[PDB]
């Protein structure tokens, strides 16, 4: 029955502007405070505001940069951050009080624009490892298996890490026998739709 | 009775 | 003053159908007088889920959120019980103070699946030379299937502590096994790494009875 509907995911870069928006649904829009909660993989208290009065008031931490807001006859209440920064790159949720979250919206900040990934070989008891590094590519996500799919046991994809250059990059492993470096192809499938890169990297020893 | 004043606490915790 | 809540543990490696606790206390009375209601509720969150509403008022448990979960206390010192955890359990757990502005939350209990303890298997790669065309060399060291999340490396260039410049990242408890597994990455200019012989880290962890280095020389 209580809905709140929030905005997708945000790409923004330092000094920027970013507008997040949550639809509520269910029940009196006007009778209950909205809050806002921010997430860094934990959660920070923004503040609320007065649904009924539009008045905001911001936790000591969010006291310049951010403005809560509402378009009451819409039901929806917006986060706006100004002057975008590093620290700024979490998940923002709106929630009604204590007793139902949002989805959520993800920030990322960053001075990069869309590129694809270069993706380099991680060359390989009787255990081996070989991978891919997949490196410096924006924005999130890349998809990553191996052999099309058909190796699975064994894979580890890591999460991505957002870089000091502000490009993503993360690798992806996987153990063999030493005996299969001789008699079978690795290959990782590497798929970065916003780029329209797709590379089949073969990794040799 | 108990059940009505469940319902009126737990919305007037999250008035304007 | 701002409301303090203090989470304990901050880790909980579990197995099914054990009873699961963990704790918050507040630094301030969360009892409201005029409705002797505690402003205290507890959430559950799976990883990029968002938080869902398991018990408010400090004891009542939500509609439709099954009855292993428990919440009890009173004041200062509040409990979540779960009587009876289950895999689908595996999550973060937070409380929240709702009692005074600014609203203010535990620092959360993550559950794990408990297993025995299992040393890391340590492979160290080289940059590709099709990287260093780049002018960037990327150094990868890797712990494979590990247990607990627990460990050390270390970093070493021509033999000497390496601190900066490195960064981690570690996969979701394993489906299978329940491990871990984790990478460390050294980025270094190409200058820089062509400076140096000899790249090596060593990792430390508790199913090692000595600390292992994983390692290799420039051409070899
Ligand atoms: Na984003």
Known sequence: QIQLVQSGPELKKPGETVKISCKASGYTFTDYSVHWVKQVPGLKWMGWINTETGEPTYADDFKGRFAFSLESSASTAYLEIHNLKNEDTATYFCALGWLHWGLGTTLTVSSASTKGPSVFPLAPGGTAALGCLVKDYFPEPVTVSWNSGALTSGVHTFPAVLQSSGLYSLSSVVTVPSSSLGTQTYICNVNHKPSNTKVDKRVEP | ?16 | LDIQLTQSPSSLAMSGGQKVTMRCKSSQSLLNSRNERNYLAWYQQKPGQSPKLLVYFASIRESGVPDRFIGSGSGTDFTLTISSVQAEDLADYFCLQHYNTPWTFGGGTKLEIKRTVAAPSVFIFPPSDEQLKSGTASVVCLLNNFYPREAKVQWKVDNALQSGNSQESVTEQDSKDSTYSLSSTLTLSKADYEKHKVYACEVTHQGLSSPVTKSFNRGE
């Not at chain 2, 469940?6 to 008035?15: I, N």
């Open chain 2, 1 to 16: 009775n108990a059940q009505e004043l469940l319902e009126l606490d737990k919305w007037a915790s999250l008035w304007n």
